[PDB]
Design a protein around this ligand. Structure first.
Ligand SMILES: Nc1ncnc2c1ncn2[C@@H]1O[C@H](COP(=O)(O)OP(=O)(O)O)[C@@H](O)[C@H]1O
Ligand SMILES: Nc1ncnc2c1ncn2[C@@H]1O[C@H](COP(=O)(O)OP(=O)(O)O)[C@@H](O)[C@H]1O
Ligand SMILES: [Mg+2]
Ligand SMILES: [Mg+2]
Ligand SMILES: [Zn+2]
Lengths: 48, 344, 676
């Protein structure tokens, strides 16, 4: 009469050097593009 | 509570201090072992000294000498030997009890089995191993089998049990004391026969016991009245009859014994001289008695060792760092009383 | 200031963490590689034993390089002396895994620096390429295997015990060898923490077929592994606690370095692991299994004699071949050898040694002398073209039950290297020889050794020899008469060696040895059997005031102070002398001794010529005189047996049975002639 076991994680170390053709880096690049790109001195995408 | 876990403190301190302040600790404790049994004072004193124990000594070079006492009672039927055995086994914190053929073979020693919880083999100990650092009570001692007698023989010898059988070759630790009971060969004792022919057990086994009490039943119209009054009063009430004496409960007895077990008195030169003189006299005396076929055994160095252990136990009970001549006097007094029944 | 090359284990342990002002603090630990290596180098280059002034470890490294040894035995206690390593001690105790590799790399770099900075010779490639290792052997005191907690896993500990069984060598894979079944291209893969990563595709550009890699078993590279079953003997035992046996894992060079019956002291790492519930599934059990990993083994001590080298001749050559650096016998210094010679030079050597044995037991000069001669042992002949004769000596003790004929057995048991102490009624024929048992782990049937085989090369102590059943006693005949045991049981047919001496005790019938009856009516053994023993000792107790006073004073002196303080040699020197004498000398007999031997044997046969009144003489007594004379000559560092030796042997053999105080007609004993 027991319940279900859990699973979880946490970061400690640094894995291998991140390649570019990986989803996490793709997402990081896209997030940077959203949060930084400027046109006519404006953050168009952030504002919209 | 185990003796090993003892620890001084105000709560124990005030109780113990009150007990000593009351005084007469020796007799007061001795009279409190099974207070429902009339008479039998010296046996009770010997049992108390057995409970307290002697002083272990490490002589160096790996050699070792025991510090525990062994007691045998041998007597006529119907004198409450079993009652005393029960009382001592109950008072002891690690006491074990056994009777004759009821426990035999692997009942003593140990047996090889497999643990359910884990998947490793183990040895399950018998009464002797279960009573380690405690008192083992053996009723109907004379009726035991040869193998069990040999096991007790070796245990009283050196506190270890050696086993070499199929699937096992080892040695077990049995740091335990022995309290045994026995009856004469033909039931009642026969004064027209020698003491060694009155019993079935070997003389060497009898000799290895530190104390060997003989209890006979000689009718006496005077003391029989006292015994009858005592027993019938005990039945009519549920208490002992005396009023001028108050027994001390087992908890306090264990407390004081645990406190005492922390001492380690030492021998001095004057007491050493007294002991050597006494031993020489006793050893010279015993020879003529044994010649007439009227002795359970000739005096031997085990007797001297027993005297030393008893003196140490008395000192520990007194709660002192050094022994005195009175302790040796009392030890010899007891050893002399132990065979007074053979001279009536 | 020296050269350095990183090791694979160091690179693996490279990944650092922050929060340590040096940086490079391994996650989970507190070890710092730079400080540990620096402290180790400083300690190695500067430490003296405070001969106590010289650089202790610099030499050891020098002889290591000179001889080609690759293993450094490090006493973990030393690190507590030097001020720097006061913390490295605890670091080594708590995190052995990383620390050992750190020390190994430091040692290799130290060796390279030592060889190069002095321009000794240019042949350094061999040392630069070879491996090194360090073995701690003096970890602090432990409290027994029972008292460790789960938090003590992966710590360093030490144990003492008795070896019982050893599984055969188990091959352990290290490099797997795959082949492509379409292009014959072969690959090698190195194990990683016990997992092999099988390839999923041939790596050739021309051949890229998926799942074409097969494993060739014989082409892999394997290591050595062995499992030992140990019967531990902790110093402190709690209430009501019984033994069990522990599992030890030995790897690489240490395999086959132990034999059942040996008493050893091991230093290892405490481990844990889960076990599969069943072979079919891959489920595991929550409750873990514990064992030990051996990193050092000590097989010598100063409290007991060295193993008789005559029984381990081949094992020494195998040790030399295997390059394992475990030592069987202790080392002897020039000062010690000179002291041995000086001690042998004096004239009271015999009595001095006799008194030295068992100082706590009084008098019994002849008994102690017999024990000494037994320990020394006779000479072992070996006949080219087949034939064996051994110098083992058997002794029995009869006498009054209350004498000190039992304390002797304990002392001999604790001083001898191998042996077993057994009682008479608590034994059995199978239990003394061998048996088959089901291993609880492998679930198979394996043979296990008995007391007599375990005691090979040592002493077997038997108590209450007269209570032994006839069936059990039957086996001793061959052991005493050929030092072998033949077995014909299901699955095994062979003969085993039993090169052991016998020390037995017995009690007289009834209460006391009656001097009004012959020895045959006082001892409950068949008269023929008593003729097999080399010596028979009649321990009689006579009442005498002088002796009583002496013994009582001797006993009562022991309680004067809480600790023992009792012209006696120390046990260490005694054992050293006995071991040296046993190993280095081998006496031989001469014609002058032969004539006396023949004359004495003929006289013994003639004297006493109505029967079953005395132990009749036999060839066993002639052989006993031979052995005793050889042992006496071997003592005191002589190589030729002589007339004095033979006379002493005959004197002792007669005195043991005390024929002087015996009536040669009725076989009785006169108490006024026997001397205390
Ligand atoms: N001195 C005594 N005082 C009180 N009761 C006694 C005394 N002696 C014997 N008895 C009684 O006699 C019985 C003896 O039985 P038991 O305890 O088996 O001793 P035994 O085995 O010697 O007969 C006990 O039940 C006990 O109550
Ligand atoms: N010569 C002696 N030297 C020292 N102690 C002795 C001597 N003789 C007897 N003893 C004492 O007497 C006891 C001998 O009993 P034990 O050796 O167990 O009996 P046995 O060996 O005959 O079976 C020991 O406790 C020991 O202290
Ligand atoms: Mg009864
Ligand atoms: Mg003994
Ligand atoms: Zn391919």
């Amino acid at each position: 009469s027991f319940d279900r076991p859990e699973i979880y994680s946490a970061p400690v170390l640094q894995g291998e050097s991140p390649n570019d053709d990986d989803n996490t880096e793709i997402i990081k690049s896209f997030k940077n593009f959203i949060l930084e790109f400027r046109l006519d001195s404006q953050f168009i995408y952030r504002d919209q | 509570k185990k003796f090993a876990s003892f620890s001084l403190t105000s709560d124990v301190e005030e109780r113990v201090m009150e007990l000593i302040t009351s005084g007469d600790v020796y007799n007061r404790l001795a009279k409190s072992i099974a207070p429902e049994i009339y008479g039998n004072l010296d046996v009770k004193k010997a049992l108390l000294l057995l409970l307290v124990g002697g002083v272990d000594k490490r002589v160096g070079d790996g050699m070792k000498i025991r510090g525990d006492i062994n007691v045998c009672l041998m007597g006529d039927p119907g004198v409450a030997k079993s009652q005393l055995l029960k009382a001592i086994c109950k008072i002891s914190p690690r006491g074990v009890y056994t009777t004759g053929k009821g426990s035999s073979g692997v009942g003593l020693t140990a047996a090889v089995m497999k643990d359910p919880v884990t998947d490793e083999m183990i040895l399950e100990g018998g009464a002797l191993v279960l009573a380690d650092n405690g008192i083992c009570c053996i009723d109907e001692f004379d009726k035991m089998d040869e193998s069990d007698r040999t096991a007790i023989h070796e245990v009283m010898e050196q506190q270890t049990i050696s086993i070499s059988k199929a699937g096992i070759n080892t040695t077990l630790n049995a740091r335990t004391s022995i309290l045994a009971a026995a009856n004469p060969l033909y039931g009642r004792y026969n004064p027209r026969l020698s003491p060694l022919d009155n019993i079935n057990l070997p003389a060497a086994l009898l000799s290895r016991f530190d104390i060997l009490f003989l209890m006979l039943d000689i009718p006496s119209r005077d003391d029989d009245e006292k015994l009858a009054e005592h027993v019938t009063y005990v039945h009519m009430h549920n208490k002992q009859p005396d009023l001028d004496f108050t027994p001390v409960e087992p908890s306090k007895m264990r407390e004081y014994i645990a406190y005492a077990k922390t001492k380690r008195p030492v021998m001095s030169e004057a007491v050493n001289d007294y002991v050597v003189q006494a031993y020489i006299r006793l050893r010279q005396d015993s020879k003529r008695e044994m010649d007439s076929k009227f002795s359970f055994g000739q005096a031997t160095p085990r007797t001297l060792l027993g005297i030393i252990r008893l003196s140490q136990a008395l000192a520990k009970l007194r709660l002192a760092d050094m022994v005195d001549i009175d302790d040796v006097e009392e030890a010899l007094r007891l050893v002399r009383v132990s065979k007074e029944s053979l001279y009536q | 200031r020296s050269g350095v090359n990183t090791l694979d284990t160091s690179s693996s342990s490279a990944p650092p963490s922050e929060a340590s002002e040096p940086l490079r603090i391994i996650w989970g630990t507190n070890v710092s590689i730079q400080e540990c290596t620096t402290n180790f180098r400083n300690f190695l280059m500067s430490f003296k034993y405070k001969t106590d002034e010289e650089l202790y470890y610099i030499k050891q490294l020098n002889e290591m390089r000179e001889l080609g040894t690759s293993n450094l035995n490090l006493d973990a206690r030393n690190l507590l002396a030097y001020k720097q390593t006061e913390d490295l001690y605890h670091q080594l105790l708590n995190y052995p895994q990383e620390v050992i590799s750190i020390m190994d790399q430091t040692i290799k770099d130290c060796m390279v620096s030592l060889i190069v900075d002095n321009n000794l010779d240019y042949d350094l490639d061999e040392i630069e390429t070879k491996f090194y290792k360090v073995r701690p052997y003096n970890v602090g005191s432990c409290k027994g295997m029972r008292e460790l907690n789960p938090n003590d896993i992966d710590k360093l500990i030490n144990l003492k015990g008795l070896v019982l069984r050893s599984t055969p060598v188990i091959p352990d894979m290290k490099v797997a060898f795959f082949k492509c079944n379409v292009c014959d291209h072969t690959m090698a893969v190195e194990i990683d923490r016990g997992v092999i990563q099988e390839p999923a595709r041939c790596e050739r550009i021309d051949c890229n077929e998926p799942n074409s890699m097969s494993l060739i078993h014989n082409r892999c590279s394997f290591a050595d592994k062995q499992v030992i079953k140990l019967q531990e003997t902790p110093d402190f035992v709690p209430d009501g606690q019984t033994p069990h046996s522990i599992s030890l894992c030995v790897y690489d060079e240490l395999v086959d370095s132990c034999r059942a019956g040996d008493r050893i002291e091991v230093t290892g790492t405490f481990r844990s692991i889960p076990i599969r519930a069943n072979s079919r599934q891959r489920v595991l059990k929550s409750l873990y299994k514990t064992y030990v990993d051996v990193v050092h083994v000590k097989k010598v001590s100063d409290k007991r004699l060295d193993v008789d080298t005559s029984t381990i001749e081949q094992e020494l050559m195998q040790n030399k071949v295997d390059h394992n650096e475990v030592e069987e016998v202790r080392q002897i210094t020039d000062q010690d050898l000179a002291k041995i010679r000086e001690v042998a030079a004096r004239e009271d050597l015999y009595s001095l040694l006799a008194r030295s044995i068992a100082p706590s037991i009084y008098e019994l000069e002849d008994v102690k002398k017999g024990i000494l001669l037994q320990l020394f042992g006779g000479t072992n002949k070996t006949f080219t073209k087949g034939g064996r004769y051994r110098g083992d000596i058997n002794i029995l003790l009869c006498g009054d039950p209350s004498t000190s004929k039992s304390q002797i057995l304990q002392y001999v048991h604790k001083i001898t290297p191998r042996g077993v102490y057994t009682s008479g009624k608590g034994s059995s024929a199978v239990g003394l020889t061998a048996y088959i048992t089901r291993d609880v782990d492998t679930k198979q049937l394996v043979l296990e050794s008995g007391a007599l085989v375990l005691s090979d090369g040592g002493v077997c102590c038997i108590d209450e020899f007269d209570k032994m059943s006839d069936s059990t006693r039957s086996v001793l005949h061959e052991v005493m008469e050929q030092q072998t045991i033949s077995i014909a049981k299901a699955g095994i047919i062979t003969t085993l060696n039993a090169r052991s001496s016998i020390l037995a005790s017995a009690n007289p019938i009834g209460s006391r040895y009656n001097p009004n009856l012959p020895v045959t009516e006082n001892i409950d053994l068949p008269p023929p059997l008593l003729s097999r023993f080399d010596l028979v000792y009649l321990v009689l107790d006579k009442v005498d005031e002088k002796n009583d006073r002496e013994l009582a004073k001797h006993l009562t002196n022991l309680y004067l102070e809480d600790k023992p303080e009792h012209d006696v040699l120390p046990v260490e020197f005694l054992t050293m002398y006995i071991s040296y004498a046993k190993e280095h000398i081998h006496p031989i007999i001469t014609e002058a001794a032969k004539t006396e031997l023949v004359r004495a044997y003929v006289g013994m046969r003639k004297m006493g010529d109505s029967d079953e009144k005395r132990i009749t003489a036999t060839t066993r007594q002639l052989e006993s005189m031979i052995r005793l004379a050889e042992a006496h000559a071997k003592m005191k560092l002589k190589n030729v047996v002589e007339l004095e030796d033979v006379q002493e042997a005959v004197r002792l053999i007669r005195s043991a049975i005390k024929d002087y105080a015996t009536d040669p007609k009725t076989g009785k004993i006169d108490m006024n002639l026997v001397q205390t």
